[PDB]
Design an enzyme around this catalytic site. Structure first.
Site, PDB file in Angstrom:
ATOM      1  N   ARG A  98       0.812  -1.210   0.000  1.00  0.00           N
ATOM      2  CA  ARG A  98       0.000   0.000   0.000  1.00  0.00           C
ATOM      3  C   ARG A  98       0.848   1.263   0.000  1.00  0.00           C
ATOM      4  O   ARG A  98       0.464   2.251  -0.629  1.00  0.00           O
ATOM      5  CB  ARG A  98      -0.940   0.046   1.195  1.00  0.00           C
ATOM      6  CG  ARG A  98      -2.123  -0.891   1.176  1.00  0.00           C
ATOM      7  CD  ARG A  98      -3.118  -0.413   2.226  1.00  0.00           C
ATOM      8  NE  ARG A  98      -3.820   0.803   1.798  1.00  0.00           N
ATOM      9  CZ  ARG A  98      -3.556   2.033   2.238  1.00  0.00           C
ATOM     10  NH1 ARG A  98      -2.572   2.235   3.106  1.00  0.00           N
ATOM     11  NH2 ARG A  98      -4.257   3.063   1.791  1.00  0.00           N
ATOM     12  N   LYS A 101       2.214   1.709  -3.510  1.00  0.00           N
ATOM     13  CA  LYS A 101       1.166   2.180  -4.407  1.00  0.00           C
ATOM     14  C   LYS A 101       0.752   3.611  -4.076  1.00  0.00           C
ATOM     15  O   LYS A 101       0.397   4.374  -4.977  1.00  0.00           O
ATOM     16  CB  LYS A 101      -0.032   1.227  -4.368  1.00  0.00           C
ATOM     17  CG  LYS A 101      -1.103   1.520  -5.417  1.00  0.00           C
ATOM     18  CD  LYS A 101      -2.240   0.511  -5.376  1.00  0.00           C
ATOM     19  CE  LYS A 101      -1.828  -0.809  -6.018  1.00  0.00           C
ATOM     20  NZ  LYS A 101      -2.964  -1.764  -6.136  1.00  0.00           N
ATOM     21  N   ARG A 257     -17.089 -38.751 -20.045  1.00  0.00           N
ATOM     22  CA  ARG A 257     -17.292 -37.623 -19.147  1.00  0.00           C
ATOM     23  C   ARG A 257     -16.973 -37.986 -17.704  1.00  0.00           C
ATOM     24  O   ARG A 257     -16.575 -37.106 -16.933  1.00  0.00           O
ATOM     25  CB  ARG A 257     -18.712 -37.070 -19.298  1.00  0.00           C
ATOM     26  CG  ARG A 257     -19.865 -38.005 -18.973  1.00  0.00           C
ATOM     27  CD  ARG A 257     -20.414 -37.757 -17.578  1.00  0.00           C
ATOM     28  NE  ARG A 257     -20.682 -36.338 -17.377  1.00  0.00           N
ATOM     29  CZ  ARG A 257     -21.765 -35.703 -17.804  1.00  0.00           C
ATOM     30  NH1 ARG A 257     -22.716 -36.357 -18.453  1.00  0.00           N
ATOM     31  NH2 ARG A 257     -21.904 -34.407 -17.568  1.00  0.00           N
ATOM     32  N   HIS A 262     -13.862 -36.743 -13.233  1.00  0.00           N
ATOM     33  CA  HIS A 262     -13.190 -37.343 -12.091  1.00  0.00           C
ATOM     34  C   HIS A 262     -11.680 -37.408 -12.258  1.00  0.00           C
ATOM     35  O   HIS A 262     -10.998 -37.818 -11.310  1.00  0.00           O
ATOM     36  CB  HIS A 262     -13.736 -38.746 -11.859  1.00  0.00           C
ATOM     37  CG  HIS A 262     -15.184 -38.772 -11.497  1.00  0.00           C
ATOM     38  ND1 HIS A 262     -15.934 -39.927 -11.512  1.00  0.00           N
ATOM     39  CD2 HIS A 262     -16.021 -37.785 -11.105  1.00  0.00           C
ATOM     40  CE1 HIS A 262     -17.173 -39.649 -11.153  1.00  0.00           C
ATOM     41  NE2 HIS A 262     -17.252 -38.356 -10.896  1.00  0.00           N
ATOM     42  N   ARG A 832     -27.120 -23.442 -11.876  1.00  0.00           N
ATOM     43  CA  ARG A 832     -26.633 -24.742 -12.331  1.00  0.00           C
ATOM     44  C   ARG A 832     -27.573 -25.465 -13.284  1.00  0.00           C
ATOM     45  O   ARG A 832     -27.160 -26.459 -13.888  1.00  0.00           O
ATOM     46  CB  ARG A 832     -26.386 -25.668 -11.150  1.00  0.00           C
ATOM     47  CG  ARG A 832     -25.160 -25.368 -10.341  1.00  0.00           C
ATOM     48  CD  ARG A 832     -24.993 -26.438  -9.288  1.00  0.00           C
ATOM     49  NE  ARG A 832     -25.955 -26.305  -8.194  1.00  0.00           N
ATOM     50  CZ  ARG A 832     -26.977 -27.127  -7.982  1.00  0.00           C
ATOM     51  NH1 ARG A 832     -27.203 -28.141  -8.805  1.00  0.00           N
ATOM     52  NH2 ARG A 832     -27.789 -26.922  -6.957  1.00  0.00           N
ATOM     53  N   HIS A 837     -27.767 -26.399 -18.887  1.00  0.00           N
ATOM     54  CA  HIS A 837     -28.673 -27.102 -19.782  1.00  0.00           C
ATOM     55  C   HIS A 837     -29.032 -26.283 -21.013  1.00  0.00           C
ATOM     56  O   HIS A 837     -29.909 -26.699 -21.776  1.00  0.00           O
ATOM     57  CB  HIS A 837     -29.945 -27.511 -19.044  1.00  0.00           C
ATOM     58  CG  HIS A 837     -29.742 -28.606 -18.047  1.00  0.00           C
ATOM     59  ND1 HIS A 837     -29.433 -28.363 -16.728  1.00  0.00           N
ATOM     60  CD2 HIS A 837     -29.809 -29.951 -18.176  1.00  0.00           C
ATOM     61  CE1 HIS A 837     -29.320 -29.512 -16.086  1.00  0.00           C
ATOM     62  NE2 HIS A 837     -29.543 -30.492 -16.942  1.00  0.00           N
TER      63      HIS A 837
END
Length: 937
Positions: A98, A101, A257, A262, A832, A837
RNA sequence: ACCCCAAUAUCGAAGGGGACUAAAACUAGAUUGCUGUUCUACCAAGUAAUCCA
RNA sequence: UGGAUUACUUGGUAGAACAGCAAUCUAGUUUUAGU
């Protein structure tokens, strides 16, 4: 250089401390009882005294460390543990960042821009405690995912090389794309099938939980669509379903898949899999669609009637499969073409033919021979031990380099020397190199050929009236002499399933996964994904009922015939939809002297008699979303005039002015190569206020006569797009790109929820687990509760208290696994299910804005700091093809569900030329992109 | 505007990299305009038959 | 002699298959220079 010089069971006991102390909510008291020991606000005063000199240099961090020595005991006065010393470490290094910066900010208040940040203006901030808690959370989260990544890919941690941060950092960026590709075939194969009952209008998961009673849908499927499935032995006659969806395509689909999600790299599945005669079916589909050289009866085998053995010499040129890097350096066929035409007009063995239309046949037969010859003389590869008169490239190396220099890259190094000489203020060097290579190739042609340029014997359009008429009208002409125009082998089942998926998607979906098999193979310098990078390149290049078994143009008759027939797939519903939409366009509500759609939709006799074929309407009657997409362009279609063919001012555009504007934009792309942008800008703006040196350019009347012609060609291309329906493809493109780009990050979250569980099983925090097979979800969900910790997840837990502790930890990081919390909302209110989908393309505008889902995925990925603006930057690059982005505004912090007037400062009208003109449809496609994102109805 | 770099709770790390800026060839694609050959449909002028005479 | 069922001659136009050229944009590869 962080991990493998440390963490000898020592970082583990600090992360194991921080996790169960963020869980008990103690760091938000530890941090201020520790940071009160830091004394501030007099260091700010002496910083003010040193910046009163205006230093901004190497005398300031000594003042900060001196005040640190005043506060903190630099002598070892205490006996603190490693954890609290690392809190000291994080706070001190964060304050160092900081203050550096804020020193570059103090530089940036006195330079030419004065963006101000006063030092005492910011105290009660991340200085006290706002972001240092976020810093500790990001530290612990990175180490937990770092442990879980190595645990997931079953790597021994002691034998970790640094090289495996390159072998494994790229084989899962490919797997995100291979999961997003694996679910956009699940929606394409739902437009073909449905369940046995009519009441189910939802999607199937073919790849996962299998189910019987899964039968065909007798709509939306075309002859090109149904022919592929009928040829792949998926359906038999009478449209029943064979038993390869229970033995061939289901079982091989799900295992891939499983092994991608996995990360199972254990072995190959079984020998009972897709053997070679199950692959020859796909080989046959790739064979019977590609073009045949015998099927090229259009370069006119009357031009080489007496020269019918020079091309046997051409076809006997041997080539091999080096695909050498000495093709980047020779100039392409576009530069040798004018000189080969001028060499044809240099031969003193042929005459002016009959007229100007006799020899266009000859030139279009000859340019195809010269163009394929140029890629066989370069690639003319190795030879035996008595070969004297040799290949083209050795004369090229003889002209460039001296003797005893053949086995050295003189072409590569000579191009590099030409480029170095170009970069020192000598712009001509690259063109001089290209002209030397071209005159070398010309000198090579004249001594080994020009018997093919010998056109003494000639028929002056006297028998080629009926030469090819007699050649086609007679059959059994086996001596159709051709050009060879330089095998498809599938090795294992990964290739076999990606090829079948690739002949079931759109031609932009393969560009998404071809480029990712490419950029992974460039990253690893291997050649493992080479049998797949070219099968995808031959299916992208392939793009019977066209006019024979197709459009009769009298639409009463075919609808009546295929009603009374119960060209079988031509359902009367789509014909009536096409009929109805063209009737909606052509019906003059302004019933006056107005027939402006003549020769566009109908051949000079309208009103239910005759209708012209259109392919950007007929290939959108059929998707189940058409009338939602179509509604916001149709009024724009039905109000554009016919300036095309109705007047002189639209046929002077199709003949003369487009070529003049291209000629003006081709005499500046060669005058202005290899110049820096300051010179191109100071020249491109003097071309605007020029008053004498536009007459040295191509046209005259310095810039008004160019911009009027550009405006006229601009509005011509405006009107051509909508009447041909060239916006019903842009909208479908935008929807499939946005849904693809959101499903990427929604698969990324599913990967990170594996990394969390593995990284906290190694640390012993969520211990006593187990592996549940079949289900491929990381975390349990409350779907079917009271025992839901065991079954509905790939990982089993021990008791419900372990899952509740896991949920408390994930909520502490910022990942809420409660009921109905934008994850476990029931149907389509969860992200999801609406995005994994593909419902942005299947059902647009249904109860959610598009810009209201970009926010719901950009907030589900906010638990990490490296994912900041990783969705506003990933989605908004779709639109750079048609509008300019403003990246400075886009790296900032904002949101889209509110915050009015933001899609105008984030994207600009696409300003395009090498004279910096504006695009022809900039405003229309910009407003159409804005209205596509925000419409809720 | 973010990550990493030590003798490290701290002790010229009071620094340095990723990195940007610009320019070449080559490759692949999308749209628009043009050129050539075959196939199909529509319109207009012409040549050649009863029928009405 | 004019309207009319006929067959083919070029001539605009429009669609489908294939081959080539030019402009504009996009993705990539190899490389050059400097900060």
């Amino acid at each position: 250089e962080k991990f493998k010089i440390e963490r000898e069971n020592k970082k583990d006991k600090i992360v194991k401390f921080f996790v169960e102390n963020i869980k008990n909510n103690s760091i938000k008291e530890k941090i201020e009882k520790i940071l009160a020991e830091f004394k501030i606000d007099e260091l700010i005063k002496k910083l003010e005294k040193e910046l009163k000199k205006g230093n901004c240099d190497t005398e300031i961090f000594g003042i900060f460390k001196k005040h640190y020595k005043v506060n903190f005991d630099s002598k070892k006065f205490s006996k603190k543990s490693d954890e609290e010393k690392e809190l000291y470490k994080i706070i001190y290094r964060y304050l160092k960042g900081r203050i550096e910066k804020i020193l570059v900010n103090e530089q940036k208040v006195r330079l030419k821009k004065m963006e101000k940040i006063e030092i005492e203006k910011i105290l009660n901030e991340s200085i006290l405690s706002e972001k240092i808690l976020k810093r500790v959370k990001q530290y612990t989260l990175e180490h937990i995912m770092y442990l879980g990544k190595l645990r997931h890919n079953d790597i021994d941690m002691t034998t970790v090389n640094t090289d495996d941060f390159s072998r494994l950092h790229a084989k899962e960026e490919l797997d995100l794309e291979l999961i997003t590709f694996f679910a956009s075939t699940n929606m394409e194969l739902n437009k073909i099938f449905s369940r046995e009952n009519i009441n189910n209008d939802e999607n199937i998961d073919f790849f996962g939980g299998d189910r019987e009673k899964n039968y065909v849908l007798d709509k939306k499927i075309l002859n090109s669509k149904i022919k592929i499935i009928r040829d792949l032995d998926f359906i038999d006659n009478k449209n029943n379903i064979t038993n390869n969806f229970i033995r061939k395509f289901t079982k091989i689909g799900t295992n891939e898949r499983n092994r991608i999600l996995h990360a199972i790299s254990k072995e190959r599945d079984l020998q009972g899999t897709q053997d070679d005669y199950n692959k020859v079916i796909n080989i046959i589909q790739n064979l019977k669609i590609s073009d045949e050289e015998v099927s090229k009866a259009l370069n006119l085998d009357v031009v080489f009637k007496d020269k019918k053995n020079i091309i046997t010499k051409i076809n006997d040129i041997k080539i091999s499969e080096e695909n050498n890097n000495d093709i980047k350096y020779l100039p392409s066929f576009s530069k040798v073409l004018p000189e080969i035409l001028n060499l044809y007009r240099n031969n003193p063995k042929n005459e002016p033919f009959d007229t100007i239309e006799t020899e266009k046949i000859v030139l279009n037969a000859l340019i195809y021979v010269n163009k394929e010859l140029y890629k066989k003389l370069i690639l003319e590869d190795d030879l035996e031990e008595n070969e004297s008169k040799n290949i083209f490239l050795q004369e090229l190396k003889k002209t460039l380099g001296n003797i005893d220099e053949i086995d050295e890259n003189i072409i590569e190094n000579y191009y590099k020397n030409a480029q170095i000489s170009a970069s020192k203020g000598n712009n001509k060097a690259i063109k001089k190199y290209q002209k030397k290579v071209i005159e070398c190739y010309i000198g090579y042609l004249r001594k080994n050929y020009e018997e093919l340029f010998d056109f003494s014997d000639f028929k002056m359009n006297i028998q080629e009236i009926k030469k090819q008429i007699k050649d086609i009208n007679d059959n059994k002409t086996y001596e159709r002499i051709t050009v060879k125009t330089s095998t498809i082998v599938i090795n294992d089942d990964f290739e076999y399933i990606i090829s079948i998926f690739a002949l079931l998607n759109s031609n932009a979906v393969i560009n998404k996964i071809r480029n990712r098999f490419f950029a992974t193979s460039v990253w690893l310098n291997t050649s493992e994904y080479q049998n797949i990078i070219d099968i995808l390149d031959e299916i992208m290049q392939l793009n019977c009922i066209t006019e024979n078994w197709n459009l009769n143009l009298e639409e009463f008759i075919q609808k009546m015939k295929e009603i009374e027939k119960d060209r079988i797939i031509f359902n009367s519903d789509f014909l009536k939809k096409y009929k109805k939409e063209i009737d909606n366009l052509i019906e003059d509500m302004e019933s006056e002297n107005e027939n402006k759609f003549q020769e566009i939709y109908y051949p000079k006799e309208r009103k239910n008699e005759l209708y012209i074929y259109k392919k950007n309407l007929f290939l959108n009657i059929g998707n189940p979303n058409f009338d939602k997409i179509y509604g916001l362009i149709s009024n724009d279609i039905k109000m554009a005039d016919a300036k095309f063919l109705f007047n002189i001012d639209g046929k002077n555009i199709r003949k003369n002015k487009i070529s003049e504007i291209d000629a003006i934009l081709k005499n500046l792309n060669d005058k202005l190569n290899g110049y820096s942008k300051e010179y191109k800008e100071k020249y491109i703006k003097k071309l605007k206020e020029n008053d004498d040196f536009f007459a040295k350019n191509i046209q005259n009347k310095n810039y008004k006569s160019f911009e009027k012609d550009y405006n006229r060609v601009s509005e011509y291309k405006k009107i051509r797009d909508l009447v041909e329906f060239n916006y019903l493809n842009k909208i479908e493109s935008y929807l499939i790109d946005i849904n693809w780009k959101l499903a990427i990050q929604m698969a990324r979250f599913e990967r990170d929820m594996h990394y969390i569980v593995n990284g906290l099983r190694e640390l012993g925090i969520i211990k006593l687990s187990g592996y549940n097979t079949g289900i491929s979800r990381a975390y349990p969900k409350r779907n079917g509760s009271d025992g839901f910790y065991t079954t509905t997840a790939y990982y089993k837990f021990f008791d419900e208290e372990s899952y509740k502790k896991f949920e408390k930890i994930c909520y502490g990081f910022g990942i809420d696994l409660s009921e109905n919390s934008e994850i476990n909302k029931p149907e389509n209110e969860s992200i999801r299910n609406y995005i994994s989908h593909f419902y942005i393309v299947r059902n647009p505008f249904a109860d959610y804005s598009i810009a209201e889902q970009i926010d719901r995925v950009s907030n589900l990925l906010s638990y990490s700091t490296r994912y900041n603006n990783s969705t506003y930057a990933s989605v908004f690059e779709v639109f750079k093809k048609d509008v300019n982005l403003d990246y400075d505004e886009l790296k900032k912090k904002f949101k889209l569900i509110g915050n009015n007037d933001i899609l105008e400062r984030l994207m600009k009208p696409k300003k395009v030329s090498v004279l910096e003109l504006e695009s022809y449809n900039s405003d229309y496609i910009k407003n159409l992109i804005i209205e596509l994102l925000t419409k809720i109805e």
